[PDB]
Amino acid sequence: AKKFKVVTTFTIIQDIAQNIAGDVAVVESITKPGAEIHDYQPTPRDIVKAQSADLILWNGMNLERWFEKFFESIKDVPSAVVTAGITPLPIREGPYSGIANPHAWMSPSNALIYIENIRKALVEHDPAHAETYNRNAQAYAEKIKALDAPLRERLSRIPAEQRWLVTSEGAFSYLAKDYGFKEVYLWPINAEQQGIPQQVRHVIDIIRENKIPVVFSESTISDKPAKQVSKETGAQYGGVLYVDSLSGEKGPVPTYISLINMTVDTIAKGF
Ligand SMILES: [Mn+2]
């Protein structure tokens, strides 16, 4: 009858978890493709959705500023933080300085740890399907491991000194560390905040000093500040990167694997 039901806070976890669950459990996301996840405002239908689940997955590292208050309205549903065991990179400036940068999934090696935490959660709370979860997790982990070589090859045309990654949110720190990029951003983490117009001038100084050819925005936030930066520098606007959300199932970024590939592909294109 009713399959084991998993509810996640946002879409990236949904797709990783669904790959481990296979045909044996149904995984749904509270947030919709394209929606901003950091300061999402849960509605009454989200409570019913989360309350209907057998297990709730969230990122932690205070990604979902809304989750803990929301979860107080949910009774008798176990939850698991899928970043357990990941060493955080701290936010480097702004009013959230020193807090964990929550975007750990942009490192494919960190995704192996996401996968293991989700597998553990599913095996524990749905032990009747532990064998399917264990098989699916190991197969999906191998798919993630197979990304490292093509990803580095795709970025290999860009010499080390020119590997500057200029984005809107500083959401790519884990990806940048993995593939040897230095990061510049217009704001360190999505939030309601001051300091963005002045950071735009500092970034402009950095674009000129280092001859950076391309700046990017992201799929859940406005492209306007990055487009402005491109106008008042030489650098071209390299388009939209994906980090905080997948696209819809027929859009360009329907899976976690496609999010990593398309973000790296768009970066490489921009150079
Ligand atoms: Mn973000």
mmCIF file of C-alpha atoms and ligand atoms in Angstrom:
data_model
loop_
_atom_site.group_PDB
_atom_site.id
_atom_site.type_symbol
_atom_site.label_atom_id
_atom_site.label_comp_id
_atom_site.label_asym_id
_atom_site.label_seq_id
_atom_site.Cartn_x
_atom_site.Cartn_y
_atom_site.Cartn_z
ATOM 1 C CA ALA A 1 0.000 0.000 0.000
ATOM 2 C CA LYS A 2 1.392 3.353 1.144
ATOM 3 C CA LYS A 3 5.160 3.349 0.657
ATOM 4 C CA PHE A 4 7.535 4.625 3.316
ATOM 5 C CA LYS A 5 7.283 8.418 3.051
ATOM 6 C CA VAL A 6 10.293 10.770 3.298
ATOM 7 C CA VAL A 7 10.015 14.567 3.321
ATOM 8 C CA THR A 8 13.051 16.800 2.805
ATOM 9 C CA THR A 9 13.421 20.516 3.334
ATOM 10 C CA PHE A 10 14.686 21.296 -0.197
ATOM 11 C CA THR A 11 15.167 19.774 -3.625
ATOM 12 C CA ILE A 12 18.837 18.724 -3.660
ATOM 13 C CA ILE A 13 18.315 16.390 -0.669
ATOM 14 C CA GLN A 14 15.101 15.156 -2.270
ATOM 15 C CA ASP A 15 16.939 13.942 -5.368
ATOM 16 C CA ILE A 16 19.846 12.339 -3.487
ATOM 17 C CA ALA A 17 17.396 10.609 -1.106
ATOM 18 C CA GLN A 18 15.182 9.398 -3.977
ATOM 19 C CA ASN A 19 18.197 7.756 -5.611
ATOM 20 C CA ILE A 20 18.854 5.810 -2.415
ATOM 21 C CA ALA A 21 15.164 4.979 -1.916
ATOM 22 C CA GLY A 22 14.538 3.819 -5.486
ATOM 23 C CA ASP A 23 11.045 2.363 -6.034
ATOM 24 C CA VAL A 24 10.711 1.439 -2.357
ATOM 25 C CA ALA A 25 9.953 4.828 -0.752
ATOM 26 C CA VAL A 26 8.536 8.140 -1.945
ATOM 27 C CA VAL A 27 10.643 11.247 -1.303
ATOM 28 C CA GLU A 28 9.138 14.742 -1.456
ATOM 29 C CA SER A 29 10.607 18.215 -0.865
ATOM 30 C CA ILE A 30 8.898 20.952 1.148
ATOM 31 C CA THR A 31 10.336 23.722 -1.035
ATOM 32 C CA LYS A 32 9.558 23.877 -4.765
ATOM 33 C CA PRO A 33 12.071 24.133 -7.619
ATOM 34 C CA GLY A 34 13.283 27.719 -7.881
ATOM 35 C CA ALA A 35 12.220 28.779 -4.406
ATOM 36 C CA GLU A 36 14.712 30.468 -2.061
ATOM 37 C CA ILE A 37 15.470 27.987 0.730
ATOM 38 C CA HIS A 38 17.415 29.955 3.354
ATOM 39 C CA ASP A 39 14.520 32.185 4.480
ATOM 40 C CA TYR A 40 11.587 30.179 3.103
ATOM 41 C CA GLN A 41 8.295 30.866 4.911
ATOM 42 C CA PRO A 42 6.473 27.588 5.647
ATOM 43 C CA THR A 43 2.719 27.473 5.098
ATOM 44 C CA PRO A 44 0.023 25.348 6.791
ATOM 45 C CA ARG A 45 0.083 22.832 3.935
ATOM 46 C CA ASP A 46 3.812 22.296 4.615
ATOM 47 C CA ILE A 47 2.986 21.232 8.193
ATOM 48 C CA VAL A 48 0.482 18.633 6.952
ATOM 49 C CA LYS A 49 3.019 17.430 4.388
ATOM 50 C CA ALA A 50 5.804 17.060 6.951
ATOM 51 C CA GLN A 51 3.374 15.482 9.432
ATOM 52 C CA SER A 52 2.426 12.835 6.858
ATOM 53 C CA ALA A 53 6.041 11.626 6.565
ATOM 54 C CA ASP A 54 7.713 8.639 8.180
ATOM 55 C CA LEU A 55 11.068 10.488 8.206
ATOM 56 C CA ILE A 56 12.244 14.073 7.678
ATOM 57 C CA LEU A 57 15.645 15.006 6.228
ATOM 58 C CA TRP A 58 17.215 18.443 6.481
ATOM 59 C CA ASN A 59 20.603 19.927 5.770
ATOM 60 C CA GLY A 60 21.398 21.507 9.106
ATOM 61 C CA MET A 61 24.471 23.758 9.289
ATOM 62 C CA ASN A 62 21.661 26.339 9.776
ATOM 63 C CA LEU A 63 20.823 26.220 6.081
ATOM 64 C CA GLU A 64 17.063 26.317 6.696
ATOM 65 C CA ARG A 65 16.671 29.199 9.160
ATOM 66 C CA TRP A 66 12.979 28.211 9.273
ATOM 67 C CA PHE A 67 13.261 24.492 10.008
ATOM 68 C CA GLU A 68 13.625 24.213 13.774
ATOM 69 C CA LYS A 69 10.659 26.465 14.566
ATOM 70 C CA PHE A 70 8.627 24.675 11.887
ATOM 71 C CA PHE A 71 9.584 21.237 13.210
ATOM 72 C CA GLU A 72 8.112 22.115 16.616
ATOM 73 C CA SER A 73 4.662 21.765 14.999
ATOM 74 C CA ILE A 74 5.467 18.182 13.891
ATOM 75 C CA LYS A 75 4.865 15.253 16.245
ATOM 76 C CA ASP A 76 6.171 11.661 16.266
ATOM 77 C CA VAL A 77 8.158 11.964 13.024
ATOM 78 C CA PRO A 78 11.888 11.214 13.233
ATOM 79 C CA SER A 79 14.363 13.506 11.527
ATOM 80 C CA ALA A 80 18.025 13.307 10.547
ATOM 81 C CA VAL A 81 20.588 15.970 9.668
ATOM 82 C CA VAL A 82 22.288 14.855 6.464
ATOM 83 C CA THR A 83 25.509 16.832 6.962
ATOM 84 C CA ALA A 84 26.513 14.838 10.076
ATOM 85 C CA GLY A 85 30.268 14.272 9.864
ATOM 86 C CA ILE A 86 31.042 17.014 7.339
ATOM 87 C CA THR A 87 33.624 19.559 8.422
ATOM 88 C CA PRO A 88 32.113 23.004 7.743
ATOM 89 C CA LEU A 89 33.829 25.834 5.970
ATOM 90 C CA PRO A 90 33.023 29.014 7.921
ATOM 91 C CA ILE A 91 31.398 32.082 6.459
ATOM 92 C CA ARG A 92 34.206 34.593 5.981
ATOM 93 C CA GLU A 93 32.587 38.054 6.226
ATOM 94 C CA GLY A 94 29.309 39.856 6.864
ATOM 95 C CA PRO A 95 26.782 39.540 9.687
ATOM 96 C CA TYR A 96 26.977 35.709 9.620
ATOM 97 C CA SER A 97 30.783 35.581 9.770
ATOM 98 C CA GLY A 98 32.122 32.495 11.563
ATOM 99 C CA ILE A 99 28.868 30.535 11.028
ATOM 100 C CA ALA A 100 29.088 27.352 8.944
ATOM 101 C CA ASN A 101 28.717 27.828 5.199
ATOM 102 C CA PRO A 102 25.770 25.430 4.688
ATOM 103 C CA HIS A 103 26.363 24.629 0.995
ATOM 104 C CA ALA A 104 28.358 21.444 1.649
ATOM 105 C CA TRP A 105 26.651 19.486 -1.151
ATOM 106 C CA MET A 106 28.580 21.432 -3.822
ATOM 107 C CA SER A 107 31.596 19.222 -3.051
ATOM 108 C CA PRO A 108 30.985 15.824 -4.679
ATOM 109 C CA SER A 109 33.155 14.171 -2.041
ATOM 110 C CA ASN A 110 30.886 15.678 0.652
ATOM 111 C CA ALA A 111 27.905 14.196 -1.230
ATOM 112 C CA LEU A 112 29.252 10.749 -0.363
ATOM 113 C CA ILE A 113 28.687 11.715 3.283
ATOM 114 C CA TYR A 114 25.185 12.994 2.510
ATOM 115 C CA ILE A 115 24.508 9.632 0.847
ATOM 116 C CA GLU A 116 25.792 7.643 3.837
ATOM 117 C CA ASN A 117 23.720 9.678 6.323
ATOM 118 C CA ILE A 118 20.556 9.238 4.266
ATOM 119 C CA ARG A 119 21.188 5.497 3.814
ATOM 120 C CA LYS A 120 21.681 5.113 7.585
ATOM 121 C CA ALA A 121 18.467 7.027 8.298
ATOM 122 C CA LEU A 122 16.441 4.950 5.819
ATOM 123 C CA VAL A 123 17.861 1.620 7.036
ATOM 124 C CA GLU A 124 17.149 2.523 10.653
ATOM 125 C CA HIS A 125 13.563 3.713 10.195
ATOM 126 C CA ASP A 126 12.529 1.392 7.322
ATOM 127 C CA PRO A 127 14.481 -1.795 8.101
ATOM 128 C CA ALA A 128 12.231 -3.949 5.884
ATOM 129 C CA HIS A 129 13.974 -2.409 2.860
ATOM 130 C CA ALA A 130 17.513 -2.119 4.246
ATOM 131 C CA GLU A 131 18.914 -4.361 1.481
ATOM 132 C CA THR A 132 17.491 -2.144 -1.273
ATOM 133 C CA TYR A 133 18.701 1.039 0.425
ATOM 134 C CA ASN A 134 22.172 -0.431 0.907
ATOM 135 C CA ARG A 135 22.423 -1.566 -2.721
ATOM 136 C CA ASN A 136 21.051 1.754 -4.051
ATOM 137 C CA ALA A 137 23.368 3.882 -1.873
ATOM 138 C CA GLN A 138 26.509 2.090 -3.005
ATOM 139 C CA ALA A 139 25.491 2.304 -6.659
ATOM 140 C CA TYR A 140 24.692 6.009 -6.362
ATOM 141 C CA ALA A 141 27.981 6.671 -4.513
ATOM 142 C CA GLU A 142 29.873 5.154 -7.450
ATOM 143 C CA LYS A 143 27.995 7.479 -9.817
ATOM 144 C CA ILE A 144 29.087 10.454 -7.701
ATOM 145 C CA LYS A 145 32.696 9.204 -7.605
ATOM 146 C CA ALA A 146 32.672 8.896 -11.416
ATOM 147 C CA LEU A 147 32.127 12.674 -11.672
ATOM 148 C CA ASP A 148 35.554 13.745 -10.373
ATOM 149 C CA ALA A 149 37.629 13.041 -13.506
ATOM 150 C CA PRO A 150 35.313 14.683 -16.131
ATOM 151 C CA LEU A 151 34.716 17.655 -13.804
ATOM 152 C CA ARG A 152 38.430 18.412 -13.367
ATOM 153 C CA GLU A 153 39.100 17.809 -17.065
ATOM 154 C CA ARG A 154 36.289 20.216 -17.972
ATOM 155 C CA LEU A 155 37.958 22.961 -15.880
ATOM 156 C CA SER A 156 41.534 22.112 -16.908
ATOM 157 C CA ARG A 157 41.806 24.838 -19.595
ATOM 158 C CA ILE A 158 41.867 27.551 -16.891
ATOM 159 C CA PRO A 159 45.351 28.204 -15.416
ATOM 160 C CA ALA A 160 45.617 28.312 -11.631
ATOM 161 C CA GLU A 161 46.258 32.052 -11.335
ATOM 162 C CA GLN A 162 43.068 32.787 -13.315
ATOM 163 C CA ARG A 163 40.764 30.409 -11.391
ATOM 164 C CA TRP A 164 38.554 33.115 -9.862
ATOM 165 C CA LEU A 165 34.902 32.208 -9.264
ATOM 166 C CA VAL A 166 32.775 35.352 -8.995
ATOM 167 C CA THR A 167 29.172 34.713 -8.014
ATOM 168 C CA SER A 168 26.307 36.446 -6.213
ATOM 169 C CA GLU A 169 25.855 34.328 -3.093
ATOM 170 C CA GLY A 170 29.095 32.906 -1.675
ATOM 171 C CA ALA A 171 27.460 29.510 -2.125
ATOM 172 C CA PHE A 172 30.326 27.782 -3.926
ATOM 173 C CA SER A 173 33.056 27.661 -1.261
ATOM 174 C CA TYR A 174 33.028 23.868 -1.098
ATOM 175 C CA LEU A 175 33.169 23.504 -4.870
ATOM 176 C CA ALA A 176 35.889 26.169 -5.106
ATOM 177 C CA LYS A 177 38.074 24.442 -2.514
ATOM 178 C CA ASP A 178 37.722 21.057 -4.285
ATOM 179 C CA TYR A 179 38.780 22.363 -7.714
ATOM 180 C CA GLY A 180 41.267 25.079 -6.770
ATOM 181 C CA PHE A 181 39.264 28.263 -7.362
ATOM 182 C CA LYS A 182 39.493 31.471 -5.400
ATOM 183 C CA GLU A 183 36.057 32.810 -4.551
ATOM 184 C CA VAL A 184 34.534 36.283 -4.807
ATOM 185 C CA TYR A 185 30.894 36.968 -4.040
ATOM 186 C CA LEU A 186 28.448 39.850 -3.808
ATOM 187 C CA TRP A 187 27.037 38.603 -0.505
ATOM 188 C CA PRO A 188 28.365 35.829 1.731
ATOM 189 C CA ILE A 189 25.039 34.011 2.412
ATOM 190 C CA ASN A 190 21.438 34.633 1.347
ATOM 191 C CA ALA A 191 19.600 36.708 3.963
ATOM 192 C CA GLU A 192 17.993 40.072 4.462
ATOM 193 C CA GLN A 193 21.114 42.197 4.861
ATOM 194 C CA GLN A 194 22.956 45.474 4.351
ATOM 195 C CA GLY A 195 26.402 45.759 2.783
ATOM 196 C CA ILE A 196 25.502 44.508 -0.709
ATOM 197 C CA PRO A 197 25.891 47.823 -2.637
ATOM 198 C CA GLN A 198 29.320 48.397 -1.069
ATOM 199 C CA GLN A 199 30.430 44.806 -1.618
ATOM 200 C CA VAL A 200 29.559 45.380 -5.290
ATOM 201 C CA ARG A 201 32.242 48.085 -5.407
ATOM 202 C CA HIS A 202 34.860 45.909 -3.694
ATOM 203 C CA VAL A 203 34.180 43.052 -6.134
ATOM 204 C CA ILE A 204 34.605 45.564 -8.961
ATOM 205 C CA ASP A 205 38.070 46.405 -7.621
ATOM 206 C CA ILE A 206 38.903 42.677 -7.532
ATOM 207 C CA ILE A 207 37.674 42.084 -11.092
ATOM 208 C CA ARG A 208 39.986 44.790 -12.414
ATOM 209 C CA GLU A 209 43.093 43.939 -10.346
ATOM 210 C CA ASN A 210 42.930 40.305 -11.456
ATOM 211 C CA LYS A 211 41.494 40.561 -15.012
ATOM 212 C CA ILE A 212 38.581 38.255 -14.131
ATOM 213 C CA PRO A 213 36.609 37.589 -17.345
ATOM 214 C CA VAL A 214 33.241 36.345 -16.051
ATOM 215 C CA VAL A 215 30.780 36.803 -13.174
ATOM 216 C CA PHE A 216 27.701 34.682 -12.396
ATOM 217 C CA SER A 217 24.377 34.670 -10.569
ATOM 218 C CA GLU A 218 22.285 31.788 -9.193
ATOM 219 C CA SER A 219 18.911 30.268 -9.942
ATOM 220 C CA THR A 220 17.030 31.235 -6.754
ATOM 221 C CA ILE A 221 18.157 34.885 -6.497
ATOM 222 C CA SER A 222 18.134 38.021 -8.659
ATOM 223 C CA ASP A 223 20.605 38.241 -11.562
ATOM 224 C CA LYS A 224 20.577 42.034 -11.395
ATOM 225 C CA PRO A 225 23.599 42.703 -9.098
ATOM 226 C CA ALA A 226 25.843 40.373 -11.108
ATOM 227 C CA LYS A 227 24.661 41.890 -14.396
ATOM 228 C CA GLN A 228 25.450 45.320 -12.970
ATOM 229 C CA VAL A 229 28.948 44.151 -11.976
ATOM 230 C CA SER A 230 29.455 42.895 -15.531
ATOM 231 C CA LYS A 231 28.471 46.286 -16.986
ATOM 232 C CA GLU A 232 30.892 48.300 -14.824
ATOM 233 C CA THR A 233 33.810 45.910 -15.465
ATOM 234 C CA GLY A 234 35.237 44.198 -18.513
ATOM 235 C CA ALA A 235 33.839 40.876 -17.313
ATOM 236 C CA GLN A 236 30.957 39.254 -19.159
ATOM 237 C CA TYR A 237 27.858 37.877 -17.430
ATOM 238 C CA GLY A 238 28.389 34.118 -17.575
ATOM 239 C CA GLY A 239 24.809 33.215 -16.734
ATOM 240 C CA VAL A 240 23.006 31.261 -14.057
ATOM 241 C CA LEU A 241 24.642 28.694 -11.764
ATOM 242 C CA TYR A 242 22.630 26.143 -9.815
ATOM 243 C CA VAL A 243 23.285 25.543 -6.112
ATOM 244 C CA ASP A 244 20.253 26.016 -3.842
ATOM 245 C CA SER A 245 17.634 24.351 -6.027
ATOM 246 C CA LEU A 246 17.153 21.932 -8.846
ATOM 247 C CA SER A 247 15.023 22.969 -11.803
ATOM 248 C CA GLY A 248 11.708 21.370 -12.655
ATOM 249 C CA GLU A 249 11.812 17.795 -13.866
ATOM 250 C CA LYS A 250 11.901 18.844 -17.526
ATOM 251 C CA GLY A 251 14.183 21.839 -17.053
ATOM 252 C CA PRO A 252 17.967 21.836 -17.464
ATOM 253 C CA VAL A 253 18.900 20.802 -13.903
ATOM 254 C CA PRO A 254 16.497 18.055 -12.784
ATOM 255 C CA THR A 255 18.934 15.990 -10.649
ATOM 256 C CA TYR A 256 21.778 16.558 -8.204
ATOM 257 C CA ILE A 257 24.266 15.115 -10.738
ATOM 258 C CA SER A 258 22.985 17.492 -13.407
ATOM 259 C CA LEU A 259 23.372 20.396 -10.968
ATOM 260 C CA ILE A 260 27.055 19.699 -10.422
ATOM 261 C CA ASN A 261 27.747 19.103 -14.108
ATOM 262 C CA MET A 262 25.841 22.112 -15.375
ATOM 263 C CA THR A 263 27.356 24.463 -12.789
ATOM 264 C CA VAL A 264 30.885 23.369 -13.669
ATOM 265 C CA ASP A 265 30.043 23.386 -17.386
ATOM 266 C CA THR A 266 28.692 26.942 -17.162
ATOM 267 C CA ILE A 267 31.779 28.090 -15.229
ATOM 268 C CA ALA A 268 34.115 26.558 -17.838
ATOM 269 C CA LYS A 269 32.089 28.043 -20.708
ATOM 270 C CA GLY A 270 32.429 31.505 -19.159
ATOM 271 C CA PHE A 271 36.191 31.191 -19.477
HETATM 272 MN MN MN B 1 22.355 29.467 -0.691
#
